[PDB]
Amino acid sequence: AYTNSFTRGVYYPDKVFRSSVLHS
Amino acid sequence: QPTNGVGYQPYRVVVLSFELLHAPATVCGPKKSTNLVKNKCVNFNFNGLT
Ligand SMILES: *[C@@H]1O[C@H](CO)[C@@H](O)[C@H](O)[C@H]1NC(C)=O
Numbered sequence: 001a002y003t004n005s006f007t008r009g010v011y012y013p014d015k016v017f018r019s020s021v022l023h024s
Numbered sequence: 025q026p027t028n029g030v031g032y033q034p035y036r037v038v039v040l041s042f043e044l045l046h047a048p049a050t051v052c053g054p055k056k057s058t059n060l061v062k063n064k065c066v067n068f069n070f071n072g073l074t
Pocket residue numbers: 002003004
């Protein structure tokens with residue numbers, strides 16, 4: 001049996017605060 | 025054996041690996057804190073962030 005994940009499963013990649021920004 | 029040549033003698037090894045991170049420090053070196061200062065130009069050091 002199956003499902004589509006859509007946009008699940010992202011996580012905070014490092015322990016640094018950032019705000020109002022796009023990061024790669 | 026106690027009679028072995030130098031290359032064939034036993035040696036102890038310790039490797040110290042450092043969990044150096046932008047995260048809460050829990051092993052720190054011999055250092056003393058100051059009081060905090062605000063709203064004034066200062067030199068500063070937080071956990072080694074100079
Ligand atoms: C997931 O893979 C199966 C075959 O392994 C496929 O039949 C199914 O259509 C896929 N899932 C979705 C949500 O389409």
